[PDB]
């Protein structure tokens, strides 16, 4: 009488800077996506999410104490006893992943890690924790980061982002060229990112007036995370739902009636103008279903100087496919061919380059021959592969499997075997046995380094 495997799940993401205070008795509004912003319909209140991922910062509780509160809250909402998938804490930065008990045998390859940011006097409270796992055929990654504070420190925050994405060790270690921004079908990155509304401090009361009027446009046009993303300084290739809730920081505790912005000894004589510190972003592989269903803040949880933030997603997932052939052999019907491909790179290097193709649909990664370097009119390096690239032999040829897969590409120096660029191509093509255009930007350490384009031709068993 077996349950069919799901094609979609829903995922709850929560981020809350607890302000080193215990929570109040009831926090159910957080997990129900109730309060301000894009909120969840009351008719869904009893419907559990498949996975709940809870990020806290300045968390004063033990793991045991917080788990008890989280599992009690979900049991009260859903009448389901959730299973702990993972919990990881760095200082007062914590991530908890809970899942429905029906998913226990669908979840495997659980990994946890942390990154400590800063050096000397800036090393010791900021950084990130993360969790990854497989859910049937789908890889999922989660990062909770507490970045550097202070309106004046946006460039430090961006540097913290770069260190966390470089050094966090999650997902499949065989993906050696790839950082966390390429290792997962779906990556969620959330936390107290600490980006501020960059307006003069003498405009504090004007900001507060705008918030009372629910007029956020002239505030969001100064939000440092939106502006730094627009200028491609941080979070390149990530998505964020539109913000329609009031700034989540800095509140007087025990009410939400008051923003506490003025400089005090306790703030290091810094102003804390109302800001959207607390954020949820995501990055999914191309042409994978991911829809944000809610993004908002609670109104009734007042123990911290921050309000909790919620986001929920519908995320596509795939099954653990088994054929008569693969896993454990190739499906000789299937092939992936690349035509007229070239990489464009921002490097001043003149080493030869080769490609690596990595995918779960291959027995192991495939190394190309070196490309042919030409110079581009506007200075650039163009690496031509023509029709020279290997024919890739997937383990399964069934189009129901193969059109859902993705090929990661790294372009590496022949001289150093270091990756100069990483990207991803979807096999969710408009046609099979047809030459079709393909494209990915290339990044290294999460920054743009070039592009890969050409044509693909996919053979399936149909
Ligand atoms: S689970 C896991 C273990 C080790 C590394 N490097 C990972 F990325 C993940």
Swiss-Prot record:
Tissues where this protein is expressed: Specifically expressed in immune and hematopoietic cells. Expressed in bone marrow and blood cells. Levels vary considerably within this compartment. Present in at least 74% of immature CD34+ cells, whereas within the more mature population of CD33+ cells, it is present in only 10% of cells. Present in the majority of T-cells, while it is present in a minority of B-cells (at protein level).
Result, substituting residue 290 to E: In one patient with acute myeloid leukemya; somatic mutation
Domain of life: Eukaryota
Localisation per UniProt entry: Cytoplasm; Cell membrane; Membrane raft; Cytoplasm, Cytoskeleton
PTM entry text: Tyrosine phosphorylated by the members of the SRC family after exposure to a diverse array of extracellular stimuli such as cytokines, growth factors, antibodies, chemokines, integrin ligands and hypertonic and oxidative stress. Phosphorylated upon IgG receptor FCGR2B-binding.
Assembly description: Interacts with tyrosine phosphorylated form of SHC1. Interacts with tyrosine phosphorylated form of DOK1. Interacts with tyrosine phosphorylated form of DOK3. Interacts with tyrosine phosphorylated form of SLAMF1/CD150. Interacts with PTPN11 in response to IL-3. Interacts with receptor EPOR. Interacts with receptors MS4A2/FCER1B and FCER1G. Interacts with receptors FCGR2B and FCGR3. Interacts with receptor FCGR2A, leading to regulate gene expression during the phagocytic process. Interacts with GRB2. Interacts with PLCG1. Interacts with tyrosine kinases SRC and TEC. Interacts with c-Met/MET.
Physiological role: Phosphatidylinositol (PtdIns) phosphatase that specifically hydrolyzes the 5-phosphate of phosphatidylinositol-3,4,5-trisphosphate (PtdIns(3,4,5)P3) to produce PtdIns(3,4)P2, thereby negatively regulating the PI3K (phosphoinositide 3-kinase) pathways. Able also to hydrolyzes the 5-phosphate of phosphatidylinositol-4,5-bisphosphate (PtdIns(4,5)P3) and inositol 1,3,4,5-tetrakisphosphate. Acts as a negative regulator of B-cell antigen receptor signaling.
Family per record: Belongs to the inositol 1,4,5-trisphosphate 5-phosphatase family.
Domain notes: The SH2 domain interacts with tyrosine phosphorylated forms of proteins such as SHC1 or PTPN11/SHP-2. It competes with that of GRB2 for binding to phosphorylated SHC1 to inhibit the Ras pathway. It is also required for tyrosine phosphorylation.
Protein name: Phosphatidylinositol 3,4,5-trisphosphate 5-phosphatase 1
Gene name of the record: INPP5D
């Amino acid at each position: 009488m077996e349950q069919p495997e799901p094609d979609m799940i829903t995922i709850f993401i929560g981020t809350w800077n607890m302000g080193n205070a215990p929570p109040p008795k009831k926090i159910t509004s957080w997990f129900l996506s109730k309060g301000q912003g894009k909120t969840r319909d009351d008719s869904a209140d009893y419907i559990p999410h498949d996975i709940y991922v809870i990020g806290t910062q300045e968390d004063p509780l033990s793991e045991k104490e917080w788990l008890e509160i989280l599992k009690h809250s979900l049991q009260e909402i859903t009448s389901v006893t959730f299973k702990t998938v993972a919990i990881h804490t760095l200082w007062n930065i914590r991530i908890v992943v809970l899942a429905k008990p029906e998913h226990e045998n669908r979840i495997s390859h659980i990994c946890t890690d942390n990154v400590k940011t800063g050096i000397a006097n800036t090393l010791g409270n900021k950084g990130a924790v993360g969790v990854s796992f497989m859910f049937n055929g789908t890889s999922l990654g989660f990062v909770n980061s507490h970045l550097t504070s202070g309106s004046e420190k946006k460039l430090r925050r961006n540097q913290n982002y770069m260190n966390i994405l470089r050094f966090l060790a999650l997902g499949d270690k065989k993906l050696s060229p790839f950082n966390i921004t390429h290792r997962f079908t779906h990556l969620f990155w959330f936390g107290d990112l600490n980006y501020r509304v960059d307006l003069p401090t003498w405009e504090a009361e004007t900001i507060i007036q705008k918030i009372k009027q629910q007029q956020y446009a002239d505030l969001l046009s100064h939000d440092q995370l939106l502006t730094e993303r627009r200028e491609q300084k941080v979070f390149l290739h990530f998505e964020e739902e539109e913000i329609t809730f009031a700034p989540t920081y800095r509140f007087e505790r025990l009410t939400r009636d008051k923003y506490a912005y003025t400089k005090q000894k306790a703030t290091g004589m810094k102003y804390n103008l109302p800001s959207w510190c607390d954020r949820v972003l995501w990055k999914s592989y191309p042409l994978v279903h991911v829809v944000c269903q809610s993004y908002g803040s609670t109104s009734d949880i007042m123990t911290s100087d921050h309000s909790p933030v919620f986001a929920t997603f519908e995320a596509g997932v795939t099954s653990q496919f088994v054929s008569k052939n693969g896993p454990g052999t190739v499906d000789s019907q299937g092939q992936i061919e690349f035509l007229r491909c070239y990489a464009t790179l921002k490097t001043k290097s003149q080493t030869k380059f080769y490609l690596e193709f990595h995918s779960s649909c291959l027995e192991s990664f495939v190394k190309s021959q070196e490309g042919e370097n030409e110079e581009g009119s506007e200075g650039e390096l163009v690496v031509k592969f023509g029709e020279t690239l290997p024919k890739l032999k997937p383990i399964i040829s069934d189009p129901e499997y193969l059109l859902d897969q993705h090929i990661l590409i790294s372009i590496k120096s022949s001289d150093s075997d270091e990756s100069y660029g990483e990207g991803c191509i979807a096999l969710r093509l408009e046609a099979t046995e047809t030459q079709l255009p393909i494209y990915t930007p290339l990044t290294h350490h999460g920054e743009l380094t070039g592009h890969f384009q050409g044509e693909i031709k996919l053979q399936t068993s149909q």
